[PDB]
Amino acid sequence: SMVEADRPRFSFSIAAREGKARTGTIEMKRGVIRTPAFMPVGTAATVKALKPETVRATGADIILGNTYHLMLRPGAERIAKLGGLHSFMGWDRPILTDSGGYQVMSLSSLTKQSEEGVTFKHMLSPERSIEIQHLLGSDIVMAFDECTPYPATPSRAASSMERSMRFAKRSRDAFDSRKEQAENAALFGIQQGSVFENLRQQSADALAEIGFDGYAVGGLAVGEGQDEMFRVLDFSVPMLPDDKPHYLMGVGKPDDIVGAVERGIDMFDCVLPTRSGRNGQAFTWDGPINIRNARFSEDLKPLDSECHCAVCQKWSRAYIHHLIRAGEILGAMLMTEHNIAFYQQLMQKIRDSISEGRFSQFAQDFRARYFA
Amino acid sequence: SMVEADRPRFSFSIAAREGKARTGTIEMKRGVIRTPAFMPVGTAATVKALKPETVRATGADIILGNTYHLMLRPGAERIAKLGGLHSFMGWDRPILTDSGGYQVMSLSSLTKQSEEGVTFKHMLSPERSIEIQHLLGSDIVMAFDECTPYPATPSRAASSMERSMRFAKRSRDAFDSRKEQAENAALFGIQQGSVFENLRQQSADALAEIGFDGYAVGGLAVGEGQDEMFRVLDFSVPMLPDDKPHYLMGVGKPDDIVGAVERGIDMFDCVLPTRSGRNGQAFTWDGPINIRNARFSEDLKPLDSECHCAVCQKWSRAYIHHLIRAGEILGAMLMTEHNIAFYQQLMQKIRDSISEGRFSQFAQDFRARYFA
Ligand SMILES: [Cl-]
Ligand SMILES: [Cl-]
Ligand SMILES: [Zn+2]
Ligand SMILES: [Zn+2]
């Protein structure tokens, strides 16, 4: 039919649910994102040790671009002059960018947080963060906020949450005031409040009044331990709008992801598969292994016995053990490809199990084997 | 026809000639090698920063496996137990292995050369070198010799050449005494004699009396300068059997290769494209460039304007400049793939021009542009 014969800026659809868990899609102009989603991290315009085509071969639909490094070198204006981050690095699908503020605090010197933003050895305000993300050509822009250390007293957590909510409104208005950005990208707000239910509620209410395309749970990748993280998620995720994506920033280990999905999270990112891969840790369905251990020196099996990735089709543990011990670049490449593929296969199993109404059983089976 | 409906152990055929230059093929059980050939170097069971499929995509028909690192770690017996070097690293085509002796002298400590071979901090005799190369599963085995430093006095050059010829006979007999090796691999002898015509002649005569599948010109990648290298090649290559391959070990820069082919060399290896690629040097038809230079920070052109490699199809100088300056693994990967592809495209242009009787013109055109 003629009538049957482009993607929207942003459309999140939920296809299936089981308990608090959801599966569906985010459609954007640069592609579809299957949820729950894992985003590999690109630290300085590269997912370390992988060509973009290899990232895509693992199943990733979207990557996270750290802003902090790029705003320093090559610089946001320079990247824009060169055609934007997508062209520059050769990834044509969606990119979510962080605001830059957290890595300023973790990596910079002589930092000072204030109502104007953060200065460091350079000023990064909410408005400038949104502009930088625009210049990079981000598809999902994160509101600029003020981080809360862990542990935090109730007073400190309230102060940084309140400032973050003022910054969320400033971020909203800056994004909306740039027509090309408002029409082509999406903006996510970040819930704060440390581990305190009342502050988490105040933050969710403030963000919902402003209105965002998605809602992150901030402040939980900070050393609190899984029991506490899950306790906070238990009350925090229900506070967010149900019909928008829920993004748990900086999480995490495979079992963290499974439990967070059980609590209503749709999106994840962390450096664990890439960074710990380069350090010799490989993820397997039977738990992580450190490939440098002497027990692998003559092990002809692949990293994981079921994994479908190209690394596991072609190379042995023994070979990868040799490469990592020798400091060879190919060792980093192979470990990273496998680990990112493992994470994507985890997400696929999560999505399929929710779609089939058997996610609770999947989670129990996953844990029993992973922690055996 | 029924009558028309495996490859030999070794068959070198010359399809075309121009002056002293030749083009043709070496057929072996694991594949065909197009000559003149460039062999990427695999230092520790990896061509640094490349999967084998990427090495093959550049056009390489054969790689060089350094023996020295592998005989120490993982060890030759261990590699054999794991199925041999080809299986271990995932390269199923021919591998030429060096003897290990030169890298003992260049990288080891407390070395001592004698009529038994070389001891170091471990003994490596001619017989043990051949055995190690067997355990790795080498397709082209290099005779074990004794290197000559540059400069060398006539007396020293004669002594090491004479010992090398005694070691060449020992290598021949060791190779022949191992039936599986003799039937499936090839053995090359190495001409020595430093820069001295009379010693080069004595060495060629000794090697021809023993008999080898191919003949290397040893001792010329040692700092002597191109004029002197070419002068020695002028008289040395004609001394070798015409109907066998001529291998110039450790050479070299693009213009070294062109001039060596003009003097009758069929095979080459060096670390320049890989090692200097990781250091930021990219080869182009207009000469080498250092991609770290600030002049490339906003240059959207590919590394080379004509190169057919995947790197030049997909990424800019500006991006690769950023990666190398940032110390990113992907920078090493992309520089290395391009440089090895450039070397293979050089070899292809050499082969085609000899096949078409226009190699002299190619060499003159190549130099005029490369040194402009
Ligand atoms: Cl990383
Ligand atoms: Cl190298
Ligand atoms: Zn795998
Ligand atoms: Zn290229």
From Swiss-Prot, chains A, B:
GO terms for biological process: queuosine biosynthetic process; tRNA wobble guanine modification; tRNA-guanine transglycosylation. It holds the Pfam family TGT. Binds 1 zinc ion per subunit. Residues 250-256, 274-278 are annotated as: RNA binding. This is Queuine tRNA-ribosyltransferase. Catalyzes the base-exchange of a guanine (G) residue with the queuine precursor 7-aminomethyl-7-deazaguanine (PreQ1) at position 34 (anticodon wobble position) in tRNAs with GU(N) anticodons (tRNA-Asp, -Asn, -His and -Tyr). Catalysis occurs through a double-displacement mechanism. The nucleophile active site attacks the C1' of nucleotide 34 to detach the guanine base from the RNA, forming a covalent enzyme-RNA intermediate. The proton acceptor active site deprotonates the incoming PreQ1, allowing a nucleophilic attack on the C1' of the ribose to form the product. It comes from Zymomonas mobilis subsp. mobilis (strain ATCC 31821 / ZM4 / CP4). The keyword Heme does not apply. Substrate binds at residues 98-102, 145, 192, 219. SUPFAM superfamilies: tRNA-guanine transglycosylase. GO terms for molecular function: metal ion binding; tRNA-guanosine(34) queuine transglycosylase activity. Keywords: Glycosyltransferase, Metal-binding, Queuosine biosynthesis, Transferase, tRNA processing, Zinc. InterPro entries: ArchSynthase1/Queuine_TRR (IPR050076), TGT (IPR004803), TGT-like_sf (IPR036511), tRNA_ribo_trans-like (IPR002616). One of its GO terms (cellular component) is cytosol. Pathway: tRNA modification; tRNA-queuosine biosynthesis. It catalyses: 7-aminomethyl-7-carbaguanine + guanosine(34) in tRNA = 7-aminomethyl-7-carbaguanosine(34) in tRNA + guanine. The active site is at 98 (proton acceptor), 269 (nucleophile). Its EC number is 2.4.2.29. Homodimer. Within each dimer, one monomer is responsible for RNA recognition and catalysis, while the other monomer binds to the replacement base PreQ1. Changing residue 99 to A: Strongly reduces activity. Zn(2+) binds at residues 307, 309, 312, 338. Its cofactor is Zn(2+). Belongs to the queuine tRNA-ribosyltransferase family.
